[PDB]
Structures are given as C-alpha cells and as structure tokens.
Write a protein that binds this ligand. Structure first.
Ligand SMILES: Nc1ncnc2c1ncn2[C@@H]1O[C@H](COP(=O)(O)OP(=O)(O)OP(=O)(O)O)[C@@H](O)[C@H]1O
Ligand SMILES: Nc1ncnc2c1ncn2[C@@H]1O[C@H](COP(=O)(O)OP(=O)(O)OP(=O)(O)O)[C@@H](O)[C@H]1O
Ligand SMILES: N[C@@H](CCCCNC(=O)O[C@@H]1/C=C/CCCCC1)C(=O)O
Ligand SMILES: N[C@@H](CCCCNC(=O)O[C@@H]1/C=C/CCCCC1)C(=O)O
Ligand SMILES: [K+]
Ligand SMILES: [K+]
Ligand SMILES: [K+]
Ligand SMILES: [K+]
Ligand SMILES: [Mg+2]
Ligand SMILES: [Mg+2]
Ligand SMILES: [Mg+2]
Ligand SMILES: [Mg+2]
Ligand SMILES: [Mg+2]
Ligand SMILES: [Mg+2]
Lengths: 264, 264
C-alpha cells in the first residue's frame, strides 16, 4: 500500500496542522481520504453554524481597530496606480516583478508611494505628528513557493514629524506583535529602494521591513521631515498564527476557506 | 468679480454638501477659498481627533456584520482572475470595459463568477440553503462621469437551494436598505449576461441589479439548483448617504478623505 504522488497531494490538501494523522501510516488512500473529508466537512459546517468570518477579513478588522485606537488615520488608496510611481520609487528598469495594466498603469507592489503622498498632503492640515496606515491588496510576480504569493495583503503604518526615532519604531512593532501574540527578533538588512532596513523576523520568516528616515528618496515625494514606517504581510502573520505549511492556505482563494480545502 | 473656470473648479473641490455657501454670491475667490479651506481643515482635524475610520472601510465592516448575522458566509476571493471567466460569463468579444493583465488575466469586473464557483463547491459540504457574500474591488473601463468609477467596490450576496424566490430576494434587499436608511423602488430591466433583472433604484440612480435563477448560463458554472443574488456598488450607497454630487468623493483616492479634499 504505497501512495502515488497524486494521492499524497490530495491528502496534503485535506490535512490541517492540528491533525495527528500520518499519510505514511500504512492505511490505504481510501480510508485516509474518507477520514480527512469527514473532518473538513465538520470543520466547515462548524464555521458556517457559528462564526462565518473570513480569516483575512477578520485580521484586517482587528489590525484596523488596533491602529485607529492608537491614533493612526485609516487610509484606502488606489490599487491600480501609475507606472510612473515605479520609476519614482527608483525601481529602475525587481522591475520584472511588476504586473502591467494597459500602457501607463500597474498593480501596486507596495503601499509606500500612496502613503508618502498622504503624509505630504496631510502635513498641511493636521497637528504634529502625522500618523496613518493602510491595509489592502498588493501584487508581485514571484517564483512559486511556500512564503510568496502573487496577490497578497499588506499593512503599512507610518509616522512623520516628532517621535520618529528607532526606539519609537521598535516600540510600536513590539506592541503590535505582542497584541497578536507573535514572537519575533529584529535584524539589520538593506534594499535598493529604502537603504538600510530593520527586518522583523519570526525564525527565518520575514514578517516586515521597517525604515527610519530621512532617506535620499524623500525629495522625490516631497517629504522633508523625519519619518518612520513598517510594511507587514497579513498572509505571513496568518501562516504563523495557524501554523500553515504553505502560504496558499491563507490567500484569497477559491481553493481554501480559512485554511480548509473547498474541494470536498 | 467674475470667477474663472479654474477658480470655480477649485472652490467646487473644497465645497461639501452641508455648506450653505454659494460660489456666485459675489464674494471674491480669495475669501471663498479661505473660508472653505478653514472649514475643511477643521473637518479633517475633527476626524483625526475623534473618529479616524475611512468611509469605504467602515461601510464594508457594517455590511459584513449585517450579512454574517443573517447567516451568510463571508468570502474574500481573487481580484486578479482568468480572462477565460469573461468568455464563460458570455461577455462575448461591454468586453471593451475589461482591464487586461498580461496574456491570460484580467481585473474582475464583477463578483458573480467567483461566487458561482463557491456556491457549487460549498453545496457539497454545507446544509441547504447555501448563503454567501463578498465585498471588494471591481474594475470597468468607463466613460467618465458622476455615477461611474473605473475602480469601485462591489457587494454581492446570493443564496442557492430552498427559499430562492422573488419574494425572498425582495425581502432581503428591503431589510438591507432599511438597515442603511436608504429609500428605493424596484423596476424590471435586462442585460446580456443574466437576462431579466430586478433593478433597485434610488431615483434615477441604479443601486443594484438582482436576479432570480435558474438561468441558462447556470450549466457553464455547474449550478443546478434555484438561486437568487444581487450586486450593489458601495460608492453609490455612500453617494446617497452623504449627498455627494460626484461619485469620486466616495472613491479610493489620494484626492479626497471621507469626502474632504486633501489638497489643503
Ligand atoms: N510575494 C509576497 N507574498 C506575500 N507576502 C509578501 C510578498 N512580498 C512581500 N511580502 C510581505 O510584505 C512585507 C514588506 O515587503 P518587502 O518589500 O520588505 O518584502 P521582501 O523584503 O521583498 O520580502 P522577501 O525578502 O520575503 O521577498 C514583507 O516583509 C512580507 O511580509
Ligand atoms: N463603473 C461603476 N462604478 C461604480 N459602481 C458601479 C459601476 N458599475 C457597476 N456599479 C455598481 O455595481 C452594481 C452591479 O453591477 P451591474 O452590472 O448591474 O451595473 P450596470 O447595470 O452596468 O450599472 P450602470 O447601468 O449604471 O452602468 C450596479 O448596480 C452599481 O451599483
Ligand atoms: N519597505 C516596506 C515599507 C517601509 C515603510 C514605508 N512607510 C511609508 O509609507 O511612508 C514612506 C514615506 C517616506 C518617503 C519616501 C517614500 C516611501 C513612503 C514595504 O515595502 O512594505
Ligand atoms: N448582475 C449583478 C449580480 C447578480 C447576482 C449574482 N449572484 C451570484 O453571485 O451567484 C451567481 C450564481 C449563478 C450561476 C451563474 C453565474 C453567476 C453567479 C452584478 O454584476 O453585480
Ligand atoms: K498535520
Ligand atoms: K490570490
Ligand atoms: K453645498
Ligand atoms: K480609484
Ligand atoms: Mg521580495
Ligand atoms: Mg526581504
Ligand atoms: Mg523586506
Ligand atoms: Mg454599466
Ligand atoms: Mg444598469
Ligand atoms: Mg445593472
């Protein structure tokens, strides 16, 4: 009773992290499949009877309450953005990761350009310091794998004016991940766009890159004050919280609901 | 003291529906502009001090609670979808409204295809009737104007199995718009994709098209039961609630926050 690769793939789709079932136990495929189908139908029936909230939707709402309560303004900006923003962030023709739309547009690969525009504009009207955040879809063409999606969901929070120090940035990151119950460490890294970053790690998984400005790119966006900011992937936070093996369990998907296969 | 078209446009950007200020009162542009800038800075400072929630985000959360409480499952499905879904919904090469991405993808112009897939899949696992809904971004290339956006936000709720009658569909639409406090009437219309529709009107503004199945298109999506469904534009609901003259006030935007100009 050896399982084919097709049979193992079907069982892995139906397996969830809390199961203490092994696919190599010697039981035939028909019994492993029947048992896992029964467990997952039960799981989906319980969600329909008692919860009915989507994991990505529910986490966005929880994060939104956290930042609104700490004084950050909730932003919802365009997902379809000018291709020119890509040139101005300095992603010089990484640029291969961009989804193009028609002649002059693209799907945004990050939230920073739209939020830079909001920091600049709101500094003319609001008292110091300016505190804002956005949650929503972002897009990158990626090598397939366990920690990257082509369509994912970003949180970016940022602050401009007073209080924009490394120690305050680390304190907000720490209060945020303590609220979610997720352990982490900070390591130094760097990238083209922003220079040196403080990367927020859970083991070898990058949850966030964060930046303490000013940086030379600021003049291109009309930013002329100290600032701090961090970008987090929500599907990666869900992967840690629910111990998913593959980040697809967490994604916008017709193939999983709250980590449960929809092929039942 | 006559105002140029550029000056009137600047004042219209700064004017809000609750103002009882006229741009033709004879006052010079410099005084009308200073007064409206002061009002809008005050308005934005009050939002930052006391609310901090985005109108599109807040309405999505309110609608989500309404449908979850009435027994509908919250869905979050892909925004970037196969171009093939467009052919299969019968949008035969209206097809000019589609944003293409690379060779084989597009931005979704509606939520129905992804929700048809979820109805089919969930009918294998959940008790009758199947009740689901989604809220999120949709995309159509449009003639510019006061009631159409290229990037907008759709609610679609639907049900399959028992209870899928014209009278139950009208009763859910009625309970939903009574919850939001919006008056409406129902008129018959039709379209290519679905055939006859029940259009939900507020005056001459179309809030929704709704459908009582079965329809011949069902076989293409593997749907084989009675069903009912309705699609609503959130920016149009916000336009009615806040008496906006132009639907851009309601949109994802770097140019307005909760209907207030960000150019201050
Ligand atoms: N393709 C993707 N899929 C899912 N989440 C992603 C993806 N790209 C970035 N993120 C998330 O967005 C955050 C901010 O983006 P950033 O540009 O720092 O990513 P990155 O450094 O390119 O990530 P990686 O090094 O893993 O490719 C990341 O820390 C990660 O949580
Ligand atoms: N371009 C758009 N901008 C904003 N809302 C829209 C747009 N297109 C459709 N909607 C909203 O989505 C709902 C469901 O879509 P439907 O296909 O019935 O629109 P429609 O009949 O093409 O609208 P219209 O006749 O105004 O173009 C509409 O009733 C409307 O509330
Ligand atoms: N690298 C991380 C985000 C880093 C934080 C960005 N925060 C922010 O929105 O404000 C920036 C303001 C500075 C002016 C230059 C342009 C950037 C906008 C990511 O891609 O998720
Ligand atoms: N015309 C409106 C929506 C009408 C309701 C659709 N409801 C739904 O999601 O389920 C449909 C199930 C039937 C099988 C055929 C494919 C359609 C999916 C709009 O574009 O907003
Ligand atoms: K397991
Ligand atoms: K996806
Ligand atoms: K007015
Ligand atoms: K928009
Ligand atoms: Mg990367
Ligand atoms: Mg990295
Ligand atoms: Mg990074
Ligand atoms: Mg139309
Ligand atoms: Mg119409
Ligand atoms: Mg219609």
């Amino acid at each position: 009773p050896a399982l084919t690769k097709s049979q193992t793939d079907r069982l892995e789709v139906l397996l969830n992290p809390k199961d203490e079932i092994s696919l190599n136990s010697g039981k035939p495929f028909r019994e492993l499949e029947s048992e896992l189908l029964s467990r997952r139908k039960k799981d989906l029936q319980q969600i329909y009877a008692e919860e009915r909230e989507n994991y990505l939707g529910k986490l966005e709402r929880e994060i939104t309450r956290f930042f609104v309560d700490r004084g950050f303004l909730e932003i919802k900006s365009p997902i379809l953005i000018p291709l020119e923003y890509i040139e101005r962030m300095g992603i010089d023709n990484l640029s291969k990761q961009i989804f193009r739309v028609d002649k002059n547009f693209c799907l945004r690969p990050m939230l920073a350009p739209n939020l830079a525009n909001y920091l600049r504009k709101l500094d003319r009207a609001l008292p110091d310091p300016i505190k804002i955040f956005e949650i929503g879809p972002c897009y990158r063409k990626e090598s397939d794998g366990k920690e990257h999606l082509e369509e994912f969901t970003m949180l970016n929070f940022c602050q401009m004016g007073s209080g924009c120090t490394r120690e305050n940035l680390e304190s907000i990151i720490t209060d945020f991940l303590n609220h979610l119950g997720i352990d982490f460490k900070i390591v130094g890294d760097s990238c083209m766009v922003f220079g040196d970053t403080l990367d927020v790690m859970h083991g070898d998984l990058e949850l966030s890159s964060a930046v303490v400005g000013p940086i030379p790119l600021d003049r291109e966006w009309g930013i002329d004050k100290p600032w701090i900011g961090a970008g987090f992937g929500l599907e990666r936070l869900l992967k840690v919280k629910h111990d998913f093996k593959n980040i697809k369990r967490a994604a916008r998907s017709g193939s999983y609901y709250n980590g449960i296969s929809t092929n039942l």
